[PDB]
Amino acid sequence: KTVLEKSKAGAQSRFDSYGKLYDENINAGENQAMTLRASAAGLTTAVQASRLAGAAADLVPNIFGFAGGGSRWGAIAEATGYVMEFSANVMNTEADK
Amino acid sequence: ASRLAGAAADLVPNIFGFAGGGSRWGAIAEATGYVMEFSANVMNTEADKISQSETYRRRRQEWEIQRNNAEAELKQIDAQLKSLAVRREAAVLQKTS
Test B43 with A36 for CB contact under 8 angstroms. yes
The reported resolution of this PDB entry, expressed in Å, is 3.5
Is A18 in contact with B95 (CB distance < 8 Å)? no
Mutate to test the interface with B, among A16, A35, A50, A86 (most CBs of B within 10 A): A50
Test A27 with B26 for CB contact under 8 angstroms. no
The DSSP 8-state label assigned to residue A59 in this structure reads S
Q: What method was applied to determine this entry?
A: cryo-EM
- A47-58 b/e with 16+ CB inside 10 Å = b? bbebbeeeeeee
Distance from CA of B69 to the nearest CA of A (A): 6
d(CA A51, CA A82): 10
Instruction: Identify all chain A residues contacting B26, using CB atoms and an 8 Å cutoff.
Output: 53-54, 57
The DSSP 8-state label assigned to residue A16 in this structure reads H
CB atoms under 10 Å from CB of B48, counted, come to 13
Instruction: Identify all chain B residues contacting A5, using CB atoms and an 8 Å cutoff.
Output: 79
d(CA B96, CA B86): 15
- DSSP, residue by residue, chain B: -HHHHHHHHHS--STTSSSSSS--HHHHHHHHHHHHHHHHHHHHHHHHHHHHHHHHHHHHHHHHHHHHHHHHHHHHHHHHHHHHHHHHHHHHHHHH-
